[PDB]
């Protein structure tokens, strides 16, 4: 900022950056749908895991 001797805008866009300093948040919104996908996955997984454990000893 001390580079520009005729400054006039650096405090303006400085305040513009500090305005948008709470920039924008992300989304860990998935707490309803992702549990459904891991539910189907763990269901099929435990079914297959117990099935092959039975079929090996059979």
């Amino acid at each position: 900022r001390s580079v520009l001797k005729n400054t006039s805008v650096i405090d303006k866009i400085e305040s513009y950056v500090k305005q948008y300093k709470p920039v924008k948040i992300d989304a860990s919104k998935q707490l309803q749908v992702i549990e459904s996908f891991e539910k189907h996955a763990m269901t099929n997984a435990k079914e297959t895991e117990s099935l092959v454990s039975k079929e090996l000893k059979d």
């Binding site: 580079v3 520009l4 001797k5 005729n6």
Partner: protein, 50 residues
């Protein structure tokens, strides 16, 4: 910052053509006469000093 450096260059070239204007201002004077006295006293100062 780039535009500031460009504006400094424009100020310097304006004062360069103003230096040309100062050359035109100086060369019409009887400083052409009065300045021979300046060289005279300056040679007095230089050559006496050794």
């Amino acid at each position: 910052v780039r535009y500031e450096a460009s504006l400094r260059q424009l100020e310097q070239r304006q004062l360069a053509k103003s230096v040309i204007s100062r050359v035109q201002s100086e060369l019409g004077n009887p400083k052409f006469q009065e300045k021979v006295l300046q060289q005279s006293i300056s040679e007095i100062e230089q050559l006496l000093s050794k």
